[PDB]
Amino acid sequence: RIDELIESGKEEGMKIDLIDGKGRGVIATKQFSRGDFVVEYHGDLIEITDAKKREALYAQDPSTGCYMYYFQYLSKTYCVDATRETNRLGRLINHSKSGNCQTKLHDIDGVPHLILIASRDIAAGEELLYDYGD
Amino acid sequence: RIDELIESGKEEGMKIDLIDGKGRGVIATKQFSRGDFVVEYHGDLIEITDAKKREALYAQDPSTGCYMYYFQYLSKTYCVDATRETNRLGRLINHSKSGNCQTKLHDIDGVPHLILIASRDIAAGEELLYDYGDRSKAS
Ligand SMILES: */C=C\C(=O)NCCCNc1nc(N2CCCC2)nc2cc(OCCN)c(OC)cc12
Ligand SMILES: */C=C\C(=O)NCCCNc1nc(N2CCCC2)nc2cc(OCCN)c(OC)cc12
Predict the structure, then answer these.
(1) Helix or strand or coil: residue B91?
(2) What domains lie within chain B, and their CATH numbers?
(3) Which residues line ligand 2 (CB under 6 A)?
(4) How many whole angstroms separate alpha carbon A4 and alpha carbon A113?
(5) How many CB atoms within 10 Å of residue A103?
(6) For S-adenosyl-L-methionine, which residues are the binding ones (chain A)?
């Protein structure tokens, strides 16, 4: 239904670009409707003890930012750790208080996935910008 | 003991300074022996449900970093949120993979407090630098 895109792992309709005056960002290359799946925030799904271990081990200054997103799913606390400098576009989508992408928890076979959903219609060539949807 | 230093918020023994090449840091103005209490990482103590609402409402870009520290306490997941720019020095202590300060969970009347203890002897004049508590099965 929508699990198909998650399992796919494809990241279609977006590309990397220099936003002139902004620096790096992710750009829509196709039109999105409100409600459409945009992209997964891909990362290791881990419990909170492993998250504390990884956090303590990563050789990163906290001033450069954190890729570890905590959330609660079915009474349990999880972490999606995108620290690995992957080639996934989801973790390079920039933030904005008034974004065109909101976060959603999507469950497949009991496993939570952190995905971005279009919160409005988006034009080809627009910058994809996320907000914490809650 | 450590506990009245914490509830008092008195943070003596350290001072803000600009370090050559680095910018703001916190400096030891007295000696600390290994194991001594240094400072609390002080913030609002909140449950994760409110951590997520706060995270969603802050107009902060993630590339300048996050003051929100998640941990588990007995049953629940809590968060220490030091986002607010306060008078408190714990949140300004820079990070290092080879620092002189370790985090630990210190409890006071059933409330978790995330504190920095000295991981080695610190001389006055040294910059305080923190790492997240090491995990070992040793004494
Ligand atoms: C992705 C891992 C990560 O960034 N974790 C952030 C955890 C919370 N943020 C900070 N936590 C602390 N302490 C934890 C307990 C002892 C200190 N300290 C800082 C210090 C910071 O800056 C100091 C000045 N450069 C920042 O900057 C955002 C965050 C945290
Ligand atoms: C103190 C709040 C905080 O920093 N929270 C961090 C949450 C995890 N970090 C990031 N999470 C996301 N998403 C969560 C779900 C949708 C997107 N995205 C980013 C993007 C980032 O960079 C964008 C490109 N500059 C960063 O940079 C560290 C972190 C997160």
Answers:
(1) helix
(2) 1-139 (2.170.270.10)
(3) A 41, 65-69, 91-92, 94, 103, 114, 116, 130; B 55, 62-63, 66, 68
(4) 13
(5) 20
(6) 22-24, 67, 94-95
CB-based contact A80:A41 (threshold 8 Å): yes
Contact B52 A134 (CB under 8 A): yes
Q: Is the CB of residue B34 less than 8 Å from the CB of residue B120?
A: yes
Strands B129-131 and B94-95: parallel
- Is A95 labeled as ligand-binding? yes
Query: DSSP assignment, residue A115?
Result: E
| Phi and psi angles of residue A56, each rounded to the nearest 5 degrees, phi first | -65, -25
Point out which residues pair with B57 in neighbouring strands.
none
Parallel, antiparallel or unpaired: strands B14-19 and B23-28: antiparallel
Q: Whats the size of chain B, residue-wise? A: 139
The Cα A104–Cα A66 span in angstroms is 19
Cβ pair A53, A133 in contact under 8 A: no
Cβ neighbour number for residue A116 with a 10 Å cutoff? 27
Contact partners, residue B104, CB within 8 Å, separation at least 6: B114, B115, B117, B133
Sort residue A50 into left (φ over 0), alpha (ψ -120 to 50) or beta: alpha
Distance between start and end Cα atoms, chain B: 22
Calculated CA dihedral for residues A63, B132, B36, B110, nearest 10 degrees: 110
